[PDB]
Amino acid sequence: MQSIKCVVVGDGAVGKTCLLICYTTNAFPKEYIPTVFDNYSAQSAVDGRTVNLNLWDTAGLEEYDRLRTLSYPQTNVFVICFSIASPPSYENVRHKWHPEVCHHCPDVPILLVGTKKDLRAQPDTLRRLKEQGQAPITPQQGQALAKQIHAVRYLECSALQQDGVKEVFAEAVRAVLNPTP
Amino acid sequence: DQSTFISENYLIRWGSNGMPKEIEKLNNLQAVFTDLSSMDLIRPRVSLVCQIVRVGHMELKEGKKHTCGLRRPFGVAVMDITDIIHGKVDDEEKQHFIPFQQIAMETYIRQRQLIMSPLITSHVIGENEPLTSVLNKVIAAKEVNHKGQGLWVSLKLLPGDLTQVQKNFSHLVDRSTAIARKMGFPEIILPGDVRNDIYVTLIHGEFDKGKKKTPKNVEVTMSVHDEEGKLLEKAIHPGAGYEGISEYKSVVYYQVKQPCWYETVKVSIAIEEVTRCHIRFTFRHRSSQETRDKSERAFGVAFVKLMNPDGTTLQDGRHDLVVYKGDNKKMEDAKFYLTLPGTKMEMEEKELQASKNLVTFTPSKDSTKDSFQIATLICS
Numbered sequence: 001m002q003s004i005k006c007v008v009v010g011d012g013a014v015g016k017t018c019l020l021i022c023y024t025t026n027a028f029p030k031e032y033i034p035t036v037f038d039n040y041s042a043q044s045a046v047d048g049r050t051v052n053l054n055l056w057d058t059a060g061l062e063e064y065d066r067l068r069t070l071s072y073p074q075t076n077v078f079v080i081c082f083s084i085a086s087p088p089s090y091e092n093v094r095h096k097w098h099p100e101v102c103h104h105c106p107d108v109p110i111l112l113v114g115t116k117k118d119l120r121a122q123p124d125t126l127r128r129l130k131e132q133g134q135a136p137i138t139p140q141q142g143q144a145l146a147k148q149i150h151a152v153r154y155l156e157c158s159a160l161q162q163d164g165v166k167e168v169f170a171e172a173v174r175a176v177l178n179p180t181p
Numbered sequence: 182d183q184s185t186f187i188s189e190n191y192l193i194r195w196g197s198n199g200m201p202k203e204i205e206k207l208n209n210l211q212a213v214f215t216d217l218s219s220m221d222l223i224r225p226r227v228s229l230v231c232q233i234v235r236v237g238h239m240e241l242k243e244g245k246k247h248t249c250g251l252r253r254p255f256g257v258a259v260m261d262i263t264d265i266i267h268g269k270v271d272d273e274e275k276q277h278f279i280p281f282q283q284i285a286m287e288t289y290i291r292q293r294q295l296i297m298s299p300l301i302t303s304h305v306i307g308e309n310e311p312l313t314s315v316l317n318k319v320i321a322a323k324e325v326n327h328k329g330q331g332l333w334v335s336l337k338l339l340p341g342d343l344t345q346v347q348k349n350f351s352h353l354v355d356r357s358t359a360i361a362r363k364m365g366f367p368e369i370i371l372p373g374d375v376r377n378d379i380y381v382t383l384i385h386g387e388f389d390k391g392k393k394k395t396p397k398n399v400e401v402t403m404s405v406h407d408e409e410g411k412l413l414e415k416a417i418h419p420g421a422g423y424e425g426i427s428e429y430k431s432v433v434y435y436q437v438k439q440p441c442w443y444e445t446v447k448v449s450i451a452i453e454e455v456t457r458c459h460i461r462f463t464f465r466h467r468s469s470q471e472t473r474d475k476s477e478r479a480f481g482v483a484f485v486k487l488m489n490p491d492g493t494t495l496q497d498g499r500h501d502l503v504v505y506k507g508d509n510k511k512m513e514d515a516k517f518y519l520t521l522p523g524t525k526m527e528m529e530e531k532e533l534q535a536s537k538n539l540v541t542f543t544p545s546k547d548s549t550k551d552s553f554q555i556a557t558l559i560c561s
């Protein structure tokens with residue numbers, strides 16, 4: 001048994017806790033989860049190797065940043081969840097999320113997760129974002145984030161469809177088990 | 182339910198950037214569909230059907246320009262409004278997004294993986310499909326793979342004619358507001374309902390491929406003249422909510438055997454003068470070259486009139502049109518083609534009167550195996 005502190009970071013209303021509750025507890029949170037932060041534990045396998053995950057559901061608020069930055073130490077992989085429905089969450093990942101996780105953990109591997117890849121094609125999300133003057137995060141856009149901020153991989157998840165959830169966290173683990181070059 | 186058109190094509194100029202080519206109307210992007218009546222309230226399925234015909238060049242293909250302003254197919258948008266013609270959905274608020282379907286240009290994802298046994302051949306139909314078939318397909322289906330690619334409309338039904346609405350509810354509709362009438366006649370004809378809306382519906386047109394193995398890129402560009410080959414401006418109204426044009430342009434079905442248009446244009450001329458005029462057509466091969474786009478002549482040309490020479494205006498219904506070729510000095514001379522046959526029906530009656538009275542009647546084969554179709558609706 002080998003544990004990885006995978007502090008899942010990411011904005012509010014973008015899908016950290018949705019991805020986690022779909023992962024650790026296997027449920028899609030109906031409403032925006034009021035998050036301070038949590039501790040979970042599951043049993044997952046990574047490319048044929050089973051691993052232990054002691055996980056952290058940190059807050060996306062600007063308020064309890066001191067507590068979330070207390071969570072960043074001991075972290076071995078940073079899961080940054082930003083809404084594809086809200087690419088301003090992608091911009092926040094570019095400005096604060098990745099920079100703060102790196103200021104608290106330099107060179108500690110970071111997974112990049114595009115939450116709600118199922119909405120890149122859903123009419124409501126596209127129409128809302130076009131009315132907001134932005135487009136849902138294309139895999140090239142998240143991949144540009146990943147190359148720019150040295151994310152080990154840019155994944156996408158849809159907690160509504162349970163898409164990529166276990167895949168997201170196995171990749172988070174193998175960001176550490178197999179360090180990316 | 183009647184498989185046919187109802188209201189005239191409300192016409193919006195749209196910009197190159199997915200934007201209103203006329204931004205001044207961005208608030209007044211409005212149409213009021215007239216004449217709605219008992220059958221109209223009980224018409225089982227009526228749908229406001231929007232299309233975009235991409236003005237500019239032939240294709241968004243990098244390497245070649247095209248003569249700017251080339252009306253090219255780009256798809257259809259449809260929803261039935263029978264619920265709302267019942268009046269149920271009653272809000273000025275409801276800005277209905279309209280999921281638009283571009284005719285199926287699916288050549289991006291299905292091509293990257295076909296390996297280890299290639300035995301498949303096909304043509305290019307991403308727009309070449311008949312607009313009849315696109316129409317009926319969007320009729321039967323119930324989803325659009327638009328992915329946001331659609332347009333927003335706020336809709337309601339208002340009782341009263343142009344007047345009553347424009348008085349009790351002119352807040353929605355000013356005198357600069359665009360108007361589209363349901364194409365036809367009412368259940369109540371007031372003596373003096375003086376209209377002149379001649380909706381010319383382009384149903385299709387057959388054209389043989391010719392010398393070039395590409396079916397010559399038909400652009401029926403028809404000009405309305407007097408009885409002396411004098412073109413007149415605005416005579417062909419392309420669509421509702423916008424003023425007419427001197428000469429009308431057809432969608433250049435890119436190398437298509439039997440293009441199907443479904444287009445409609447209003448005609449409205451001085452009702453006393455319209456009697457003694459005519460029209461002429463041009464069928465050019467529109468190749469991918471600008472200089473060749475202009476230098477190519479209308480390999481086929483055609484010309485039609487307004488009244489039957491007895492004085493009766495051309496009757497409603499479908500009236501076929503031959504694509505005539507060769508010497509168009511025969512067919513562009515102020516009056517000489519008016520002496521000449523110009524459409525199917527008058528040609529076969531000329532051949533019949535030759536059969537009974539053979540007076541030097543040898544039809545020219547330039548009246549060749551290309552033709553054209555128009556159905557006339559005349560709300561004068």
Ligand SMILES: Nc1nc2c(ncn2[C@@H]2O[C@H](COP(=O)(O)OP(=O)(O)OP(=O)(O)O)[C@@H](O)[C@H]2O)c(=O)[nH]1
Nearest residue numbers: 012013014015016017018031032035060158159160
């Ligand atoms: N449709 C859809 N919505 C999602 C998905 N994931 C998250 N959401 C939405 O995001 C909202 C908030 O969930 P999270 O993204 O987990 O919130 P968070 O990232 O944990 O941020 P905090 O809880 O504030 O710390 C939910 O109410 C969902 O509506 C998804 O995969 N699909």
Ligand SMILES: [Mg+2]
Nearest residue numbers: 016017035058
């Ligand atoms: Mg959270």
